[PDB]
Symmetry: C2
């Protein structure tokens, strides 16, 4: 599992469940190619997005559909979604955990690379 | 000043000075049209990006060139940049302050709408 996503809800103090996440890879022609997608589990985590074979160096964009999430909770969010753009494995493959902490008008995201 | 951006450095405890910011507006054909750009001042603030006349309803993307910033400090950042995507003025014009707090492997962004 070289790429894992974790999403938390700062309003309820719990994992953000069933959040849609879409991963894109920057294409040779500078366009974002769809790469992987899924929904966070009951623990707010999303595993098995790729394999180390498929996860080559490139620029990747993780897009978290935060708007849908809040709407479901009857809350009016500010952001269309949260995006995390980063260059991966440029210095060889690592294990990346992208964590996002969500609030209606704010979000933070941190990368734990190992 | 309907749109203001403020950036802080969490490693140095100071405003992030000379940070490039590019604002885009979602075009009719779903493409991002360049809308405004500038650099934060010595106070970590960017003013005068638009006028209320020009700042119409739409989906906007604020891109903060975090990578350049950290590179200049001789630090190797994780993110390519920080993006903030939101729908603006859908319910009439508001004043938007987008604040970003930066670290090499993490960033948070909050919106204060008045």
């Amino acid at each position: 599992c070289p790429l894992m996503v974790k999403v938390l809800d700062a309003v309820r103090g719990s994992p953000a469940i069933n959040v849609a996440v879409h991963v894109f890879r920057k294409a040779a022609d500078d366009t974002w190619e769809p790469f992987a997608s899924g929904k966070t589990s009951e623990s707010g985590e999303l595993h098995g997005l790729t394999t180390e074979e498929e996860f080559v160096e490139g620029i990747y964009k993780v897009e978290i559909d935060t708007k849908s999430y809040w709407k479901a909770l009857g809350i009016s969010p500010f952001h269309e979604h949260a995006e995390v753009v980063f260059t991966a494995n440029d210095s060889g493959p690592r294990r990346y955990t992208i964590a996002a902490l969500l609030s209606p008008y704010s979000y933070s995201t941190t990368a734990v690379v190992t």
